[PDB]
Design a protein around this motif. Structure first.
Motif, short mmCIF file in Angstrom:
data_model
loop_
_atom_site.label_atom_id
_atom_site.label_comp_id
_atom_site.label_asym_id
_atom_site.label_seq_id
_atom_site.Cartn_x
_atom_site.Cartn_y
_atom_site.Cartn_z
N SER A 30 14.33 99.18 36.45
CA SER A 30 14.25 99.49 35.03
C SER A 30 15.68 99.64 34.52
O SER A 30 16.59 99.02 35.08
CB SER A 30 13.45 100.78 34.79
OG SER A 30 13.74 101.32 33.52
N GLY A 31 15.89 100.45 33.50
CA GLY A 31 17.25 100.69 33.01
C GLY A 31 18.06 99.45 32.74
O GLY A 31 19.26 99.43 33.05
N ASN A 32 17.42 98.38 32.22
CA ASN A 32 17.98 97.11 31.73
C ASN A 32 17.60 95.93 32.62
O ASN A 32 17.57 94.79 32.16
CB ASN A 32 19.52 97.17 31.57
CG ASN A 32 20.10 95.98 30.83
OD1 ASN A 32 19.94 94.83 31.23
ND2 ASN A 32 20.80 96.26 29.74
N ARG A 33 17.22 96.18 33.88
CA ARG A 33 16.94 95.10 34.82
C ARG A 33 15.45 94.88 35.04
O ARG A 33 15.02 94.60 36.16
CB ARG A 33 17.64 95.36 36.15
CG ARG A 33 18.82 94.44 36.44
CD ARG A 33 18.45 92.98 36.24
NE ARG A 33 19.53 92.06 36.59
CZ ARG A 33 19.39 90.74 36.63
NH1 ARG A 33 18.23 90.18 36.33
NH2 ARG A 33 20.43 89.98 36.96
N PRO A 83 18.33 88.00 43.41
CA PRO A 83 18.42 88.32 41.98
C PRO A 83 18.87 89.75 41.71
O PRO A 83 19.36 90.04 40.62
CB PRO A 83 16.99 88.08 41.47
CG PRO A 83 16.13 88.17 42.68
CD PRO A 83 16.95 87.63 43.81
N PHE A 84 18.73 90.65 42.69
CA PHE A 84 19.20 92.03 42.57
C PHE A 84 19.99 92.41 43.82
O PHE A 84 19.63 93.34 44.55
CB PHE A 84 18.04 93.00 42.37
CG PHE A 84 17.11 92.63 41.26
CD1 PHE A 84 17.55 92.59 39.95
CD2 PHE A 84 15.78 92.34 41.52
CE1 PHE A 84 16.69 92.26 38.93
CE2 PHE A 84 14.92 92.00 40.50
CZ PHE A 84 15.38 91.97 39.20
N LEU A 85 21.08 91.70 44.08
CA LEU A 85 21.97 92.09 45.17
C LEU A 85 22.76 93.33 44.76
O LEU A 85 23.29 93.41 43.65
CB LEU A 85 22.91 90.94 45.53
CG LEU A 85 23.82 91.23 46.73
CD1 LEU A 85 23.01 91.29 48.01
CD2 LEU A 85 24.92 90.18 46.83
N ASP A 88 21.06 101.33 37.64
CA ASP A 88 20.80 100.03 38.24
C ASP A 88 21.95 99.11 37.86
O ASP A 88 22.20 98.87 36.68
CB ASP A 88 19.46 99.46 37.75
CG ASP A 88 18.88 98.43 38.70
OD1 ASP A 88 19.58 98.05 39.66
OD2 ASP A 88 17.72 98.02 38.50
N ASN A 89 22.66 98.60 38.87
CA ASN A 89 23.80 97.72 38.66
C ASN A 89 23.70 96.46 39.51
O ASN A 89 24.71 95.77 39.70
CB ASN A 89 25.12 98.45 38.96
CG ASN A 89 25.44 99.52 37.94
OD1 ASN A 89 25.46 100.71 38.25
ND2 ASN A 89 25.72 99.10 36.71
N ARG A 110 29.65 98.48 47.42
CA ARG A 110 28.26 98.81 47.15
C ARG A 110 28.13 99.85 46.04
O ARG A 110 29.02 100.68 45.83
CB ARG A 110 27.56 99.33 48.40
CG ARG A 110 27.58 98.40 49.60
CD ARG A 110 26.59 97.28 49.40
NE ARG A 110 26.23 96.63 50.66
CZ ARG A 110 25.43 95.58 50.75
NH1 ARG A 110 24.93 95.03 49.65
NH2 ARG A 110 25.15 95.06 51.94
N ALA A 111 27.00 99.79 45.34
CA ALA A 111 26.60 100.85 44.44
C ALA A 111 25.67 101.81 45.18
O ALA A 111 24.97 101.42 46.12
CB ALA A 111 25.90 100.29 43.20
#
Lengths: 416, 410, 407, 416
Positions: free
Chosen positions: A258-261, B100-102, B120-121, B235-236
């Motif tokens: 969430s939060g934009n993604r 798509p979300f690495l 989320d980053n 990393r995040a």
């Protein structure tokens, strides 16, 4: 059951030289130019197969010095290939291909947020292809392999718009066919319908790869006398495609954001290849090959008095830039010039043949009837390849018995 | 105590050819597609192990031309491997994988400042893996090693343990992120690309298989690995173990908050070239490394192949609606990868005179070697690429490519 | 005066194999973890020396099959090394190191003027180090070399030679120096060396030693290139003289810092470049000691940066249906896998009056332990106990099999 | 008909050394400087051919120690080359060339527009060329090949302003001619009229490539005793041209856009080459070549007492930057300095010749009449090459019989 030609083909001491002289083809590296009915400028690209159909004179009708070699009854003559040098006559260099509307979206190397794709996002991008060298010799044309649109297995109507079924097609390599460039050996006309996924010089053509495994696994081995190859490429850039992802990533492999993604970015990756350095030390050509023993059972016999040479050489794919002035003024203005594209190929085929005789016993006539009876029919003891197109090289009236008068002939005396 | 097979396995003059013909597997390079119960499209990727279970005909029940070679009483037959050619049938090329979300935060090569991480980053990033070539032959399946979640003997760091296991067809090779169990040790599913994030990457335990007594797992092996560091990221998320103060002088003036020092590494397999290829050329097993000098116990043979030099992923594009204008919503883009193999073998028939010492020495190792000779299979829980070469053996060597090469060689 | 061991050490036909089996060390590639007194997680990095102290059984107290080989009076036994295989058991790969506050200022490749540096400009940067492979064998530990340390000025430099211990850091592209003393800001090199010492082997000395107890032989493979170009923040300790510049105006009155930095890179790692997983046969050593293991011990020093991949571990603190960075803790773990195999040859030494004299010099404890405190206990090694591991059945083992068919 | 010189040229034991000593040429890497009539500063660039016309003393008029070697009555002398070392005397390095108005538009690697080109978009860009090493030896000057503006086949006036016809021209390589640089072997003065498509050091000149296939295909082989070559390049960047697309992409290869992407981006690509690393291990020079057997029939015979050495060496093409002060003040100001360009070449040619005799029978006189009759006419038994330009090297008065006094002479004693 199948035996080497060494068993029933007797060798002589008669050697001959034959040269194609300079061969030139000049045209457009990306597409043929026809306006408005027939071709004005041919498509000439470094990534095309060059398949030479070398026609030999019939030694049974040849003006040999003495007919005492063989008895016309029960014996027939045929040429055997023993020497070859494929001459390349242009400077080493690399040309590039592109597409003014390549389906590129983002540079995938390190950026996202940040979508989403719209209606038209095609980009004008060009690239250098994978480097490939190869050459083959045989008395039958070579086989290529590629992936095409397989049938749905004619039966039921289902969900439409889905992925096309894939099928591995083997086919004959024609002169002008495209080599693999880093995007696979596939039929882009069927499997990439948007015309915008690969550069324009292959987006409406078929890239074929040689079926080495089959041609060597063929019994008589008429397609592979021998072959040479040098391929190399690396991944230059990483992009992704725009448009609907045909098969989405399952939830088992992600934790939904969430939060934009909330909207998943597209994971349809494309990769621009690059052939890296080209060097003289890596060249396969401008050097002779001596056919001491062929891979298949056919040890270099040119059945039907013909011979096929297939060549791919992307190390001389440099595209010349031409610029003509429409109007001459004292100032530079872009509208006063037209920029063109021109690519060239320069070849020099040299061959050395050995005369052979075949005593035709009842067993030999039987063994020769299977394989091909036209070997007997033409011996007096329609061509299905006229639908296929080759670079015809007429070496009749070009045979010479004076070996030392020619480059490859000189090397053959001092070697082998 | 353990002796080479040369001591008690007598060689003959009988050689045979066997070819698998063209072998094809086609699928999705990242994940299998099943809707909604069973698989429709298999996961077929260049970074998967290809482990072939080659089944040979029993020479003791084989229709040999003359039974005068051996006496059925006190002698038994077994095939010995002397020649091998692993045929690869696709153009050389490199495919890439991504996520798509690495869990990427900053490009660590030359930038920081930096704003704190949010909620989320994750980024959509893809990369080319480490290049790997290898092939192994034995009469028992090879062993792989990987790191998994070890026992302890809240959510702290997991204990690490190196697990050895049997390499199955479809197992993932190491790609540059290590030989570990990403399903257990990376719980966020977002630290490595999607094609390995929920699977286990195994590396062959070369040191162990060679340290085996009988050497039934390693007849021989070949390998070519290469990779370099293409990019540098971090990393995040919470740094589980922070950098001690002894190694830093804490800052003020905007730099009070320490940036994350959990670095990631994108690998790259660099150039692929024909000169570096291991395949499409024959290997002659003149002398094996272990005690088993090429004897195919149980009339079976295991060939494990990893080939990332033909990992090109084909892009497929279908039109949903045809109009005179290009619009992205009118097309569906797909991914498809393929593998083409042609396995050729040359076997040597061998007989074994069974003395009391031979029967005794053979009972240890494996007694089913004797039990099947008439003098349940625990590998059926594992999955391999089965190749049935019964009815494929031929004695006419010169009729086949590898057979032709063997006559003029060795 | 000093002679090769071949003159007074007689060889036998008795060969033995010994293997350490798999050796594993697992930890953090950047720093050891101790809370709050002693270590919980050790520092395990691909850029560390692995110095094995191989302990051998006393052949004079060994249960040999026949005591007829030697007369206990005037003859003593000692092992000679003839075969070696340093086994590495991890995939090839590269790990990187960094510093959350590396003293980097500007990208010096093509940008300048105007600055200027403030109070804190440190950046979060990581990099891959120089690639290095090396291995040594001897009966004495190897020697390393490194640089160590009015007011305010530059520290004087001195080249110190020392014993290479297990866990010591190799040179990484920033030099073989004592970063704890010569780089006081702790922010000029990545955190895994900023408070440690990087040692380089003194190859020239160990070979130039008379007895050659430190170098039986050695192998090396180093490679690096300059990846990026930076400069340091802070006052330039030694300014550029005016003879080399024409002072600027028009915005360039303040001279930019000419203290340049270099991020190294080890480039590709390949199987063709490997030194390990293959046996070495000690047919003739470089030094005078032709493979004699004095004191029944042996030192193997190994550096292998081609398997420095650092595994990323991620644990979930709280499981919800949405991804949130605060719900995960990310960790770092590196591993090293070794398999040491040796093959020794039994040797006897007849002690004449001259032999006793020549042996007294060098080391008399060779005689004292023969019955005819260890100063290395302050140094720390990876102990490998090969007592009770010797076997005479060569063909039962990998390296033993190779020795039969070779050499 | 044509036989090797071994048949009619008898060898002696007489060997001689000859060295050109240091040869220096210094000038501008981009263009010659003439004010206002004739040249003040020559164009000296690493990408120029160095074709040395080595003149040898007449052995029939030479002061040999004894005339007993040959009978002046029916025996004649000629020098044969058996040893050669081309000395290079500069540090290894790479120089670059550029154009203040290069016809570069967009960086095509991963960007799209956002158009459209205006009237002038030329950029100031420089680049490093393709790396080239080569050397040839013969008694006749070498042949080059290049593409030039071919005739329309003089017939009809058609559509004016279109692409020029291409023709492959063979010509003599002169000293100062440009080597191929990655843009092809073509006549840029004719085929690129805007003068802004290639860097300034080739934009108004002709790049020639050696016609290896032809020179080897000559009967007598007087041009190629032997040759060496090392080429290498890769594609460094990808650009496109500004101006009208002379040949547009057909609709069969694209799906036209409706909005924003109605105007097709230009698909005329340029590619900057790069010579990559230069290394000592790759050098061809500073090492001797022993001419044991030549490729052609002429086995190293220097007909006419002359010898041609053609050399291209771009591995020492570093261009030195010179800076002169116009006015000295206490502050740095750009207007106080003039920046110049200077390139240098240092050579040392060493040769070792073997004295040979030719017995002139009626058959020998006849065989020598064809090939070149001036061989007989100058023997007493205008030069058409004076229109072409060479680096003349006079080795008369430089022959020495004391071999061991010289570098190449010393190596010849201990070798071959």
């Amino acid at each position: 059951k199948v035996v080497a030609t060494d068993a029933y083909v007797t060798r002589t001491n008669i050697f001959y030289h034959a040269s194609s002289s300079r061969l030139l083809a000049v045209g457009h590296p990306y597409f043929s130019i026809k306006r408005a009915n027939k071709t004005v400028v041919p498509k000439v690209s470094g990534y095309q197969y060059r398949v030479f159909k070398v026609v030999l004179p019939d030694p049974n009708k040849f003006a040999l010095p003495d007919s005492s070699l063989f008895d016309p009854t029960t014996q027939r003559l045929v040429w055997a290939c023993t020497g070859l040098e494929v001459g390349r006559g242009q400077p080493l260099g690399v040309g590039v291909s592109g597409h003014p509307f390549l389906n590129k979206y983002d540079d995938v190397e390190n950026s996202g947020s940040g979508g989403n794709p719209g209606q038209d996002n095609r980009v004008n991008v060009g690239m250098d292809y994978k480097q490939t060298q190869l050459c083959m010799v045989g008395c039958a044309p070579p086989l290529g392999e590629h992936w095409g649109k397989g049938k749905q297995c004619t039966n039921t109507p289902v969900q439409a718009g889905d992925c096309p079924p894939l099928e591995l097609i083997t086919s004959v390599i024609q002169d002008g066919d495209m080599v693999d460039t880093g995007f696979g050996a596939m039929n882009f006309a069927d499997l990439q319908t948007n015309k915008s996924d690969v550069p324009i010089d292959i987006c409406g053509t078929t890239c074929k790869y040689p079926d080495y495994l089959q041609m060597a696994a063929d019994p008589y081995g008429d397609r592979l006398f021998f072959f040479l190859r040098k391929e190399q490429m690396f991944a230059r850039h990483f992009f992704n495609r725009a448009g609907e992802v045909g098969e989405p990533v399952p939830d088992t492999l992600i934790i939904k954001g969430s939060g934009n993604r909330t909207s998943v970015g597209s994971s349809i990756y494309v990769n621009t290849p690059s052939g890296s350095l080209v060097s003289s030390e890596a060249q396969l050509f401008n050097k002779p090959y001596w056919l001491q023993k062929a891979q298949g059972h056919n040890n270099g016999i040119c059945w039907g008095n013909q011979l096929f040479v297939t060549v791919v050489d992307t190390t001389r794919s440099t595209n010349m830039t031409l610029c003509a002035s429409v109007t001459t003024s004292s100032t530079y203005t872009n509208s006063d010039y037209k920029e063109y594209m021109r690519h060239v190929e320069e070849y020099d085929l040299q061959f050395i043949f050995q005369l052979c005789s075949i005593t035709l016993s009842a067993e030999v006539v039987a063994y020769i009837h299977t394989m091909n009876p036209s070997v007997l029919e033409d011996w007096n003891f329609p061509d299905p390849y006229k639908n296929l197109s080759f670079w015809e090289v007429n070496l009749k009236e070009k045979f010479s018995s004076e070996l030392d008068q020619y480059p490859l002939g000189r090397k053959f005396l001092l070697q082998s």
